[PDB]
Amino acid sequence: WTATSGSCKGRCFELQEVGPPDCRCDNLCKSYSSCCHDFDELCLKTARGWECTKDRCGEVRNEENACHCSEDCLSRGDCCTNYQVVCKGESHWVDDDCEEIKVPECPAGFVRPPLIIFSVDGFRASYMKKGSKVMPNIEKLRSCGTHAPYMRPVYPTKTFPNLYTLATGLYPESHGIVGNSMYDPVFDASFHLRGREKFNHRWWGGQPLWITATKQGVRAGTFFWSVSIPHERRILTILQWLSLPDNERPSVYAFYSEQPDFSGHKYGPFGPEMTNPLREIDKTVGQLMDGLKQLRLHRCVNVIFVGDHGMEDVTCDRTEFLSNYLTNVDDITLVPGTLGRIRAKSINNSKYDPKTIIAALTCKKPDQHFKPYMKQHLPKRLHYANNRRIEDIHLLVDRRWHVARKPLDVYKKCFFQGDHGFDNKVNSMQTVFVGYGPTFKYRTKVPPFENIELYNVMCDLLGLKPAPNNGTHGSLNHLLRTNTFRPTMPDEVSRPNYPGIMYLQSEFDLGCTCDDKVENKLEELNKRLHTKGSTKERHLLYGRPAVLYRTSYDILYHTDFESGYSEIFLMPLWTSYTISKQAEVSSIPEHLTNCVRPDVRVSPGFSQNCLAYKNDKQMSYGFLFPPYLSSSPEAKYDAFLVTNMVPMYPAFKRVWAYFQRVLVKKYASERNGVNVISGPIFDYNYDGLRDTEDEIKQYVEGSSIPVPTHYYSIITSCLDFTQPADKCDGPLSVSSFILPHRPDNDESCNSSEDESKWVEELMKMHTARVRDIEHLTGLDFYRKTSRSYSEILTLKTYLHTYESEI
Ligand SMILES: *[C@@H]1O[C@H](CO)[C@@H](O[C@@H]2O[C@H](CO)[C@@H](O[C@@H]3O[C@H](CO[C@H]4O[C@H](CO)[C@@H](O)[C@H](O[C@H]5O[C@H](CO)[C@@H](O)[C@H](O)[C@@H]5O[C@H]5O[C@H](CO)[C@@H](O)[C@H](O)[C@@H]5O)[C@@H]4O)[C@@H](O)[C@H](O[C@H]4O[C@H](CO)[C@@H](O)[C@H](O)[C@@H]4O[C@H]4O[C@H](CO)[C@@H](O)[C@H](O)[C@@H]4O)[C@@H]3O)[C@H](O)[C@H]2NC(C)=O)[C@H](O)[C@H]1NC(C)=O
Numbered sequence: 001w002t003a004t005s006g007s008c009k010g011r012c013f014e015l016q017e018v019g020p021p022d023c024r025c026d027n028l029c030k031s032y033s034s035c036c037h038d039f040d041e042l043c044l045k046t047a048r049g050w051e052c053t054k055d056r057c058g059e060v061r062n063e064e065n066a067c068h069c070s071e072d073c074l075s076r077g078d079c080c081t082n083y084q085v086v087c088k089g090e091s092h093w094v095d096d097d098c099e100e101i102k103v104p105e106c107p108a109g110f111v112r113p114p115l116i117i118f119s120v121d122g123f124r125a126s127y128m129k130k131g132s133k134v135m136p137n138i139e140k141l142r143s144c145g146t147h148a149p150y151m152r153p154v155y156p157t158k159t160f161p162n163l164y165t166l167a168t169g170l171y172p173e174s175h176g177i178v179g180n181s182m183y184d185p186v187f188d189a190s191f192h193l194r195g196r197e198k199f200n201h202r203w204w205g206g207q208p209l210w211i212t213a214t215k216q217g218v219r220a221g222t223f224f225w226s227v228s229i230p231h232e233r234r235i236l237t238i239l240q241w242l243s244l245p246d247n248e249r250p251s252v253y254a255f256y257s258e259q260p261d262f263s264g265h266k267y268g269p270f271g272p273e274m275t276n277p278l279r280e281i282d283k284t285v286g287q288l289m290d291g292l293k294q295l296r297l298h299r300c301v302n303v304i305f306v307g308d309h310g311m312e313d314v315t316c317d318r319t320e321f322l323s324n325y326l327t328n329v330d331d332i333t334l335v336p337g338t339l340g341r342i343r344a345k346s347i348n349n350s351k352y353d354p355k356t357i358i359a360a361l362t363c364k365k366p367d368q369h370f371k372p373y374m375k376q377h378l379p380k381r382l383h384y385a386n387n388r389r390i391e392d393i394h395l396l397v398d399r400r401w402h403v404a405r406k407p408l409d410v411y412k413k414c415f416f417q418g419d420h421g422f423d424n425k426v427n428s429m430q431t432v433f434v435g436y437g438p439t440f441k442y443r444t445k446v447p448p449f450e451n452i453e454l455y456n457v458m459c460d461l462l463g464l465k466p467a468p469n470n471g472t473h474g475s476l477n478h479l480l481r482t483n484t485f486r487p488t489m490p491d492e493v494s495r496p497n498y499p500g501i502m503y504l505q506s507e508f509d510l511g512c513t514c515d516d517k518v519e520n521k522l523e524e525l526n527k528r529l530h531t532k533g534s535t536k537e538r539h540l541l542y543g544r545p546a547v548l549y550r551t552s553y554d555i556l557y558h559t560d561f562e563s564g565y566s567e568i569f570l571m572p573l574w575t576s577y578t579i580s581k582q583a584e585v586s587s588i589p590e591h592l593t594n595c596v597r598p599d600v601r602v603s604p605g606f607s608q609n610c611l612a613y614k615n616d617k618q619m620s621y622g623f624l625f626p627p628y629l630s631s632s633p634e635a636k637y638d639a640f641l642v643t644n645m646v647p648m649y650p651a652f653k654r655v656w657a658y659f660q661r662v663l664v665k666k667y668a669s670e671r672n673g674v675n676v677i678s679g680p681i682f683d684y685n686y687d688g689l690r691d692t693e694d695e696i697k698q699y700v701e702g703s704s705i706p707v708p709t710h711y712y713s714i715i716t717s718c719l720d721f722t723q724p725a726d727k728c729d730g731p732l733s734v735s736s737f738i739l740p741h742r743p744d745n746d747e748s749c750n751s752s753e754d755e756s757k758w759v760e761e762l763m764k765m766h767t768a769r770v771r772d773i774e775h776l777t778g779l780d781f782y783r784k785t786s787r788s789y790s791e792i793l794t795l796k797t798y799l800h801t802y803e804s805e806i
Pocket residue numbers: 170171173174175176202203204205206383386387388468469470687688689775
């Protein structure tokens with residue numbers, strides 16, 4: 001109940017929220033059905049439209065007008081945005097040459113350049129090029145300010161998850177808005193688009209920019225606008241707030257456009273009907289920049305023009321029906337469309353089985369346009385698992401398709417020709433970023449980056465300390481002229497041991513054998529040099545990774561590779577080796593097929609044993625540094641040390657063997673040498689973070705050998721591929737992956753074929769940032785390079801996506 005009998009007289013678009021039952025006058029009252037009776041009359045004037053005309057100049061102030069062309073309007077803060085153009089001979093902002101903004105040029109009383117966030121729903125990245133003719137205001141911001149070719153959204157590439165990711169710097173799994181539609185089993189409550197539950201605070205985790213600002217004494221405009229408030233009125237309101245007295249004036253503002261998403265759903269991303277919504281957005285931008293110029297703020301305010309996600313061609317005839325796969329179709333609840341999430345219709349049903357649902361959905365039709373995953377098996381780069389609101393069963397839908405439960409859902413729920421929500425590496429889902437103002441750089445293009453990074457930068461723009469988030473603070477410093485945040489490397493927590501030869505062969509009882517008993521100070525001084533690190537500058541190019549947690553581990557040197565060996569997990573945390581373009585691949589000699597060798601530097605008690613592998617009928621083993629890439633027959637023996645071994649399912653060994661035998665050499669050939677860092681990952685609670693030893697759910701049978709959930713590699717070379725990886729003078733180039741360590745290859749529908757038909761496609765799907773691997777391992781890489789730390793942070797956030805040119 002609201003006793004809506006008060007008045008908005010003098011309170012239009014008030015910044016403090018009045019509590020029930022007094023009536024409201026803020027930009028959200030409509031959406032709560034809580035505005036005072038006179039809100040429309042006083043606060044939503046429309047008379048005479050939004051533009052001054054010649055005849056209105058110098059007019060006598062008529063307070064009924066939507067905006068004003070009277071002489072007093074500049075000082076009252078409420079001229080039409082084109083007032084000075086029509087009545088005072090001025091030019092439109094878009095018509096002025098751009099001139100570098102070297103310092104903020106603000107009116108007296110401004111303590112800091114304000115930030116305006118201009119957010120556009122469904123603004124696909126290629127609109128910047130393809131629509132450039134009809135968007136001159138936006139094209140000016142883009143070419144005069146700082147821009148990226150595109151910005152990567154978060155998964156799912158839906159509206160609320162992405163807007164709230166922009167506001168918080170957090171993955172949806174952490175902020176809690178995990179889709180446009182959700183069920184929370186703990187609340188026993190549902191979040192929907194239409195309806196009131198979505199207004200309850202309990203859905204919204206983390207700490208959005210407006211709250212960060214408020215707690216630190218920086219005032220915020222209210223970010224959200226009722227849909228029926230027209231764009232012109234939104235702009236006029238922001239401009240009025242900017243004329244408030246110093247003590248009352250917010251420093252951060254948000255504008256939101258429902259376009260072009262709204263039309264894109266109806267007409268497809270490039271429908272001929274899309275030109276007009278793009279014109280109209282541009283016109284709104286022009287109105288803002290003209291209004292800023294009138295207020296002498298166009299060289300003071302930082303403006304961010306940012307999208308939430310793109311838009312793909314999607315139609316009713318491209319829908320897959322779960323009723324074509326499942327017999328039990330009425331025992332499930334599906335969240336449908338461009339992604340799928342499945343749960344049981346009823347908790348009172350114990351005949352519900354996720355494993356049989358998954359099997360019934362796996363590789364059932366030749367051209368099948370979705371793939372089922374248990375959420376913990378989704379690509380780690382999606383970070384889409386660690387929330388009770390994300391259903392255990394997930395379907396990744398092919399770009400251009402929908403999944404639905406039954407055909408009746410699609411005709412009794414074609415209309416739409418566009419949609420979004422697909423995998424966040426899909427080109428059609430990419431969106432835009434432009435920054436313009438004194439704090440951004442002048443005429444600068446920066447590489448594509450992820451929307452999770454923006455919250456830190458928005459904090460930097462406003463002098464705020466960001467709340468803990470998933471951005472990597474400093475990785476976007478290269479967007480900024482000043483206000484950079486100067487990050488430092490984290491301190492190493494554990495220092496390694498450097499064990500020498502400490503054990504005799506016969507102290508080991510590991511059940512391992514090797515045919516290695518074949519026998520010269522020329523070559524014997526040499527191998528001692530190798531074991532003390534004589535070739536370490538070749539194989540460890542960026543310094544050893546730092547261990548950022550308390551643990552016990554040993555550095556182990558070898559001719560061809562160096563490792564950080566964990567006495568706790570009984571295997572390396574990392575193995576580092578360099579493969580030059582000229583390197584040669586060899587086979588495992590016949591006599592050495594099953595060879596495993598005790599490491600005389602490492603105690604029996606801190607070693608794996610071969611017997612456990614013999615007895616564990618499911619589990620086999622592989623090696624981190626591959627025997628195939630040994631520099632010589634004698635160096636090959638090192639690759640068979642028990643300290644280079646790691647547990648692998650035979651099914652996974654097919655993937656791993658192909659990567660090590662075929663793909664490493666191919667990368668070295670194409671990139672002019674590569675440095676490789678590989679290792680295990682343990683993330684049994686699927687939280688994106690390194691497991692402690694007490695979290696491991698699986699061991700090699702009869703042993704303390706923990707089974708990794710994933711294996712990673714980080715493959716680095718010189719960005720200037722004319723320089724070899726081991727002699728690079730400048731910036732680096734990286735690609736990485738986090739392969740799920742699975743007992744089957746059900747994920748790959750073509751896995752019955754030769755590895756050359758399916759393995760690389762699997763690896764591509766599991767591409768990762770170095771930063772994702774850092775979180776999963778508690779390691780910190782690239783500690784010793786010639787590069788600046790901010791540049792290294794940018795490199796660590798890089799994702800190699802394998803999509804073609806945008
Ligand atoms: C991306 O960035 C984010 C943000 O930095 C990273 O997330 C952080 O990770 C931390 C480690 O997992 C986590 O720290 C824990 O916080 C617990 C207190 O949590 C509350 O307070 C914070 C701070 O204000 C708040 O943000 C939290 O909000 C969560 O929950 C609410 C409601 O439940 C949601 O609205 C909100 O969206 C958010 O949800 C997300 O996080 C939670 C985990 O907290 C998930 O469960 C959700 O799915 C969702 O993803 C909370 O309101 C604190 O209690 C923890 O301490 C335990 O463990 C430590 C070990 O150091 C130990 O000292 C304690 O004893 C304690 O153990 C006890 O509890 C155990 C579990 O109940 C039990 O087993 C034991 O026996 C003990 O009784 C811990 O410090 C931090 O909260 C989140 N922050 C956020 C915002 O999510 C994220 O990791 C990054 N991702 C990547 C890949 O890097």
